[PDB]
Design a protein around this ligand. Structure first.
Ligand SMILES: CCCC(=O)SCC[N+](C)(C)C
Ligand SMILES: CCCC(=O)SCC[N+](C)(C)C
Lengths: 534, 536
């Protein structure tokens, strides 16, 4: 028995496993329960803290993935399967993972907490791209990641009901956060320095914790990668959640909220997932059925209302986008688009893809979108039409929501740093036309290219090392700049006036001004006026 | 008594004329100024279509310019060259229907291509007698026969009670058409070729050219057309029958005239100056680049809207040259936008910008106006007074001239025409307008007419070489339907404008440069989106 691999936490003893990382050993503690399994009558309910255990709990292995839809668009294809569940599916999934340096850090170390994405309908802390070993070994970080409930199980709401109050997947995340405060010191973590970070739905989750008071006493800094609490996909109204939950209940034969929810509890997990996608009001892409709900509790108003009116003066935020946020999503519903060809579309196909990409758009607003993204020098060129369709989806769903958030936080006294991620991995299996798709910066931030067996280039290892530094420098200090290394250019803070951000690629940092400024004025200032008059 | 210059005595349908031998840098030219082409439209003939001039006896002296048509005279900056050069330079009178002819001296032996000029001035002003419209240089250097006519403006030209007999509308256009008929019958007496006639005009002159293209009885009177900074389509060049009736009866009320016969009869008893004094009071909004009395869609001269006629016409047999200057709008800003002046740099605020947009785009609802503002803001420096000043100029420029031109070039090209497109980018060294105004509306004209060739005018040597170039493009086009010099292969070519390639050339001191797309992105907003936005 290795004594470095034994830890006493409040609920009892744990045994971890020593992992090798290219530069040396790390301690992993995998599959630690942080809550009572949310099963049977506990389905749809706020999580309860895990009861203590006797003896030494085996924490050498990943636990089950929360029950979720499994992707079947391209069976066997690495570019999709890499996001699919890599352990067994179970409703019993409230577990977290901790990586630390080996030996256990002598003094308290900044803690990074990862929250995965998956549109609130999927994800798992156990995926290869979320491997905490590299950041633990190189930067000396304590990395934590949790499972949280997705789809119906995490976000089905009958607002105002005691038995399905909404947002329980966020409350799972909150409980893991409280677990870190109570327990991370035992691992050599510093509970007084906790940085949240996430991508996509995970970034929106981080944003929601910023906007929810009881969560604010559990972290100090935040990183939001390609996702925001504001925007078209991240929240629903109470009225709209009620509709979807009762619609899903009709689809599975149920049944007075008590009656309805009691009947939903008798249903096998897969019965619920089977119909999960049949409750959306429109034919759409980048929209998900069960997401955080504006309940007047976890979220006391809309993310929009809360970001305009908040005080973020003692807050540091790192925020950014990848180069081609929307390309990924096009193949999941827009006619004319596939990974197996060049996807050169017609104008007809472009107009029709806009209605699906902006499902809430009226006739007028859609043509405003089309007219705005057309190249009037080459109105019918199939390459521009394809790239523009990709741009429509990325801008509406990520880039412009991100620009809006960055501006509001900076204005409201926060310290903001912004980026665009432009390097496409040499090992990427998606076609070239997709460029740098939603999700493909994660493997670099986590430092995977340092594994020589993964076949990344030498340049990409040096790059991964740069990014791992910006991220942990940010966690340590609230500033991603190397505090003892000189060299201009420095990464400047994002401000509403200058709007400075940096590009992250193989070349040294470049400072740019204005994050799709003209285009986002269309989505953030004009389009709302056009809909609030139809 | 037969001691006068044998080369200055010419006979026309109406009788004998005596012209004058003028001096031009390269040699003498022949000028026949103030030839009457219509009965004077006075008294019971006010508002009425023109009647052909009745023949005179003996030799009519045609050695001086005639009266300028009664009109509003500019008083914004009195004594200032920038405005005075456009002001009337002869007595104002309703007796004003005269044309002018310039020809080589001696008159050419072989039939010579004819250029006809139609002046601008918003349909409320202008005169063929102004220094910038001097035909002597095109006549001497290019051997051209040049003709310019006076036509009625303001109320006298365009006040209309549509449907009536006594004031049918578009009579100023009918003056222009009568002078075109006069050229057909008479120009051969001067050595001109009636079978090669090219119309050309700037601003409202350009729009007039365009209306002659769209009006059937005019089409047989000319062969080629040049439209400078103006178009028959767009927001200012025409009005509906209903709106023209509205403006006419309002004018009547304001001057003491409270059945159309009765109302027109009372209008005809008012002094000319009273009508002018009240002209501007009938505009529906506070505005710039809008004029009270313009061509009307009467179902007669214009069988439908200019917009409809360019969309459905067959233009296979048409050659057209069209273009714009670099800063079409800047001129108009000092005549009504709070914040703007010729005597300072006119740096403005956001508030002043939004306020100016309501004036510059007077027909816009609140939604459309924020569309304009949001589109023209630079969101990296949304409060920079220099950018805001320039965007304001661009808004008015784009909406009134540049995008109507782009629509015109596109529709004619799609409908079979041969179109050549330019942007004129050279600021005259002699300009008295402040630098911020760039190259304003109207300041290519002096170059096309070759004024820099006159040494007493203080233009630079490069400006002479440049004026000579443009005179060649313009007259090659008149001659052949093609601006390019058949000999010169080394010189860069001017390609036709098409829908697929959208090619046009820059006109400056440097050799021709081909650019693609005529404010394509921005003009898509004005021509495609805005209409659809105003339809709700
Ligand atoms: C270049 C156009 C000049 C005018 O609009 S004149 C109008 C001036 N006023 C309204 C005072 C009569
Ligand atoms: C006072 C010099 C400014 C100019 O060059 S005026 C033309 C403005 N703009 C270049 C924006 C069209």
């Amino acid at each position: 028995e290795d004594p470095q691999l034994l830890v006493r936490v409040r609920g009892g003893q744990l045994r971890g496993i020593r992992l090798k990382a290219p530069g040396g050993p790390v301690s992993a503690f995998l599959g630690i329960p942080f809550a009572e399994p949310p099963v049977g009558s506990r389905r749809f309910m706020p999580p309860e803290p895990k009861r203590p255990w006797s003896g030494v709990l085996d924490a050498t292995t990943f636990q089950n993935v929360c029950y979720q839809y499994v992707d079947t668009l391209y069976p066997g294809f690495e570019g999709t399967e890499m996001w699919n569940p890599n352990r067994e599916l179970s409703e019993d999934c409230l577990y977290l993972n901790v990586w630390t340096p080996y030996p256990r850090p002598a003094s308290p170390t900044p803690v990074l907490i990862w929250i995965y994405g998956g549109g609130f309908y999927s994800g798992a802390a156990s995926l290869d791209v979320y491997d905490g070993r590299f950041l633990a070994q190189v930067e000396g970080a304590v990395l934590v990641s949790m499972n949280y409930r997705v789809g119906t199980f995490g976000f089905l709401a009958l607002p105002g009901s005691r038995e399905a109050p909404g947002n329980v997947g966020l409350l799972d995340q909150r409980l893991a956060l409280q677990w870190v405060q109570e327990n991370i010191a035992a691992f050599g973590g510093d509970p007084m320095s906790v940085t949240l970070f996430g991508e996509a739905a995970g970034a929106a989750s981080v944003g929601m914790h910023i906007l929810s008071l009881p969560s604010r006493s559990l972290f100090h800094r935040a990183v939001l990668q390609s996702g925001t609490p504001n925007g078209p996909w991240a929240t629903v109204s109470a009225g709209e959640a009620r509709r979807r939950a009762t619609l899903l209940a009709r689809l599975v034969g149920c049944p007075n909220d008590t009656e309805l929810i009691a009947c939903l509890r008798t249903r096998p997990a897969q019965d619920l997932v089977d119909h999960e996608w049949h409750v959306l009001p429109q034919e759409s892409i980048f929209r998900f059925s069960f997401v955080p709900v504006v309940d007047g509790d976890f979220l006391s108003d809309t993310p929009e209302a809360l970001i305009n009116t908040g005080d973020f003066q003692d807050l540091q935020v790192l925020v950014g986008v990848v180069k081609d946020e929307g390309s990924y999503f096009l193949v999941y519903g827009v006619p004319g688009f596939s990974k197996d060809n060049e996807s050169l579309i017609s104008r007809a196909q472009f107009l029709a893809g806009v209605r699906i990409g902006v499902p809430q758009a009226s006739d007028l607003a859609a043509e405003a979108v089309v007219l705005h993204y057309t190249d009037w020098l080459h109105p019918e060129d199939p390459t521009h039409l394809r790239d523009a369709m990709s741009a429509v989806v990325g801008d509406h769903n990520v880039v412009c929501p991100v620009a809006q958030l960055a501006g509001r936080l900076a204005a409201q006294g926060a310290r903001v740093y912004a980026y665009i991620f432009e390097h496409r991995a040499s090992t990427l299996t998606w076609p070239l036309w997709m460029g740098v798709p939603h999700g493909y910066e994660i493997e670099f931030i986590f430092g995977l290219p340092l594994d020589p067996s993964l076949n990344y280039t030498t340049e990409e290892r040096i790059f991964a090392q740069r990014l791992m530094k910006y991220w942990t420098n940010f966690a340590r200090t609230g500033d991603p700049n190397d505090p003892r290394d000189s060299k201009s250019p420095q990464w400047p803070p994002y401000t509403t006036a200058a709007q400075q951000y940096v590009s992250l690629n193989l070349k040294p940092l470049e400072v740019r001004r204005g994050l799709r400024a003209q285009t986002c004025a269309f989505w953030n200032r004009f389009l709302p006026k056009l809909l609030s008059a139809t």
